[PDB]
Amino acid sequence: MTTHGRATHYSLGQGNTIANGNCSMPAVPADRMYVAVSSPEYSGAAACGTFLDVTGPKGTVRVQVADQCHGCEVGHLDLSEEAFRALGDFNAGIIPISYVTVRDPAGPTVAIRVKEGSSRWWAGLQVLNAGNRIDRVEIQAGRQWLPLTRTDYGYWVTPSPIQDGPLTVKVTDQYGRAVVLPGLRMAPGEIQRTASRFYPVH
Amino acid sequence: MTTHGRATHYSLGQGNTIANGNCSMPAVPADRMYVAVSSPEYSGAAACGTFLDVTGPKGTVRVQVADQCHGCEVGHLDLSEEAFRALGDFNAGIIPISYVTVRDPAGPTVAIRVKEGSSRWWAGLQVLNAGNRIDRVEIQAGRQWLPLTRTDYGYWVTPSPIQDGPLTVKVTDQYGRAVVLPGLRMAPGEIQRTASRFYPVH
Numbered sequence: 594m595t596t597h598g599r600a601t602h603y604s605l606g607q608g609n610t611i612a613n614g615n616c617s618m619p620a621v622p623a624d625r626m627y628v629a630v631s632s633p634e635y636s637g638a639a640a641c642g643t644f645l646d647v648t649g650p651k652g653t654v655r656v657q658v659a660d661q662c663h664g665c666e667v668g669h670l671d672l673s674e675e676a677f678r679a680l681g682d683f684n685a686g687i688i689p690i691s692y693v694t695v696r697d698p699a700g701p702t703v704a705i706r707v708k709e710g711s712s713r714w715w716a717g718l719q720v721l722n723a724g725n726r727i728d729r730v731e732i733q734a735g736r737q738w739l740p741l742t743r744t745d746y747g748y749w750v751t752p753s754p755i756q757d758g759p760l761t762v763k764v765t766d767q768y769g770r771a772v773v774l775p776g777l778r779m780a781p782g783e784i785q786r787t788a789s790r791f792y793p794v795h
Numbered sequence: 796m797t798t799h800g801r802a803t804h805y806s807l808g809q810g811n812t813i814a815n816g817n818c819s820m821p822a823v824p825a826d827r828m829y830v831a832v833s834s835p836e837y838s839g840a841a842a843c844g845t846f847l848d849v850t851g852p853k854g855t856v857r858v859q860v861a862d863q864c865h866g867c868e869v870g871h872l873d874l875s876e877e878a879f880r881a882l883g884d885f886n887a888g889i890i891p892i893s894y895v896t897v898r899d900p901a902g903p904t905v906a907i908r909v910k911e912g913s914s915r916w917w918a919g920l921q922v923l924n925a926g927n928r929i930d931r932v933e934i935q936a937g938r939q940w941l942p943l944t945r946t947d948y949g950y951w952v953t954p955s956p957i958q959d960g961p962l963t964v965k966v967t968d969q970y971g972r973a974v975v976l977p978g979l980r981m982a983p984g985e986i987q988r989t990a991s992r993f994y995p996v997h
């Protein structure tokens with residue numbers, strides 16, 4: 594459904610390679626098109642990684658959900674300065690908008706980043722380029738799949754110690770589509786590439 | 796007073812420059828002497844940075860509180876492998892210990908690290924080398940002091956956007972001693988070492 598509301602602007606700045614915004618993105622988007630959303634819409638970070646098509650006075654742009662705006666009511670987006678300028682007059686401070694969450698946004702293959710400080714005792718995993726909301730992230734333990742816990746900062750974490758070796762992870766999106774990612778290394782901070790996608794390229 | 800209990804062992808491993816343990820230390824101590832403590836002893840990260848003098852079968856060693864052991868009861872320490880080996884037989888798995896928190900531990904001057912991703916809209920500060928528990932961290936805002944919020948991960952964070960310009964931060968410890976740190980820079984990731992100490996060197 595389309596949400597009708599308003600936008601203000603802010604900036605994460607140029608950022609870093611560790612954690613940008615409440616979603617802890619590996620980078621600020623190169624095009625600087627990102628948005629912080631209300632706490633309900635952030636949904637305990639379940640909205641992290643998703644995209645919104647936002648229409649304002651000047652037209653329509655796409656922004657990555659990057660962050661949480663605690664003071665934004667539902668329907669109020671805190672856009673990047675760049676996204677704001679593309680849609681309206683910067684000095685207006687606030688502009689009327691309408692927006693939708695993009696289904697299957699065009700994107701690269703799924704990637705995985707292990708959190709700094711992770712080990713066999715405790716680890717966080719971040720799922721990059723899923724495109725849509727992720728419902729479950731599980732690590733193989735023999736015949737079973739052990740569920741990781743969704744944090745409110747864009748990672749999924751181990752409830753209990755895991756093995757001292759290669760990791761197989763299954764990620765299931767909100768539409769029930771799953772990818773299985775084998776051979777993942779306990780390599781904190783590194784973005785590990787895969788060949789896997791939730792949906793074909795168009 | 797003195798706590799009597801038990802120790803097990805675990806490892807943070809080699810570590811990184813971003814966040815080590817739940818206290819998010821800038822580094823695993825060079826001497827690998829650290830400990831994860833029970834949730835009540837962790838006290839919402841208030842124990843972060845403090846030291847324990849731990850007595851076991853082989854003698855006494857000092858460990859830095861670096862981490863939280865959710866599964867530990869009060870009196871149960873999860874020591875680094877190195878600290879464990881210093882106190883007892885590694886393969887025993889569990890050793891009897893007694894311990895106390897060190898008052899005014901010998902150490903360097905106070906340092907401040909601004910969290911990666913910080914800006915004027917939102918920032919986190921980490922206070923390093925206070926030695927004892929910190930009770931308050933405030934940022935100067937004219938004639939007022941704005942209170943930062945203690946997170947459970949070793950930082951203190953802004954409740955609201957702050958002014959621009961040089962930061963002046965006041966840190967007050969559990970004994971009511973305050974240090975004032977002027978000229979601090981919005982420099983995410985950098986350890987900013989200051990001239991201040993809560994107590995003289997001995």
Ligand SMILES: OC[C@H]1O[C@@H](O[C@H]2[C@H](O)[C@@H](O)[C@H](O[C@H]3[C@H](O)[C@@H](O)[C@H](O[C@H]4[C@H](O)[C@@H](O)[C@H](O[C@H]5[C@H](O)[C@@H](O)[C@H](O)O[C@@H]5CO)O[C@@H]4CO)O[C@@H]3CO)O[C@@H]2CO)[C@H](O)[C@@H](O)[C@@H]1O
Nearest residue numbers: 612613614615617660709710715746814816817912917948
């Ligand atoms: O068994 C425990 C286990 O702990 C390990 O240590 C972990 C700890 O478990 C994790 O919880 C902890 O997680 C923190 C991340 O490291 C940290 O980067 C992340 O930072 C967030 C912050 O939480 C969030 O509030 C902040 O929000 C702001 C946005 O950034 C701004 O842009 C916006 O304007 O305002 C919002 C606030 O309104 O975002 C930052 C990220 O950018 O917080 C996580 C905790 O909540 O990490 C520890 C280290 O990995 C320990 O290592 C294990 O040994 C131990 O077993």
